[PDB]
Amino acid sequence: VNSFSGYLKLTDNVYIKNADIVEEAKKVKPTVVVNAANVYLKHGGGVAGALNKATNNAMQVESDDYIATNGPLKVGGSCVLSGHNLAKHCLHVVGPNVNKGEDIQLLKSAYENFNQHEVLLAPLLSAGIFGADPIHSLRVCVDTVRTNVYLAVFDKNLYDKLVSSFL
Numbered sequence: 330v331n332s333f334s335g336y337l338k339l340t341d342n343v344y345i346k347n348a349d350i351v352e353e354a355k356k357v358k359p360t361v362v363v364n365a366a367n368v369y370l371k372h373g374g375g376v377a378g379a380l381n382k383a384t385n386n387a388m389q390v391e392s393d394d395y396i397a398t399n400g401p402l403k404v405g406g407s408c409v410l411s412g413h414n415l416a417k418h419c420l421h422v423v424g425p426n427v428n429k430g431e432d433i434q435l436l437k438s439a440y441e442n443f444n445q446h447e448v449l450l451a452p453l454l455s456a457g458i459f460g461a462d463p464i465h466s467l468r469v470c471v472d473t474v475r476t477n478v479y480l481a482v483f484d485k486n487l488y489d490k491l492v493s494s495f496l
């Protein structure tokens with residue numbers, strides 16, 4: 330039994346809510362919050378910019394040290410860093426950015442990173458400004474993630490569309 334509230338159950342292990350992931354993280358303080366990162370961990374906009382802003386830029390400072398040491402992530406890859414004031418850990422996951430020309434088949438690989446963690450608060454990878462079909466992303470999520478995932482969808486109209494079209 331945990332502290333997530335108001336989530337709609339989609340499957341045995343996937344739950345969904347129309348919510349700002351930052352506000353959910355502040356309220357729940359989960360073990361793992363997922364960031365929709367890019368390979369450079371440059372947290373400018375979207376989920377990443379919003380999470381980083383809520384950490385007072387500490388996420389960016391930590392991320393720059395990570396990249397200076399290790400180089401960039403792969404599309405489809407991830408790294409575990411601090412969750413700062415928002416969570417114990419942040420799992421930075423790189424879904425493909427279709428607007429940048431990245432391979433949509435890598436979305437499944439991106440979601441596979443979630444399976445290394447028992448419970449996650451996460452956004453809908455590759456949706457919105459990353460340019461992929463969000464209905465497809467939700468289907469890949471449900472068909473790939475086996476651990477317990479609480480999805481926070483920011484856009485209200487999108488949430489309603491995802492629920493109403495879910496198979």
Ligand SMILES: O=C(O)C[C@@H](NC(=O)c1ncnc2[nH]ccc12)c1cccc(F)c1
Pocket residue numbers: 348349350351365375376379452453454455456457458459481482483484487
């Ligand atoms: O509208 C949506 O859900 C899709 C969108 N999500 C957000 O931008 C978002 N989600 C939750 N809390 C948030 N707080 C501030 C922004 C924000 C998105 C776009 C690309 C990759 C993703 F993984 C998710």
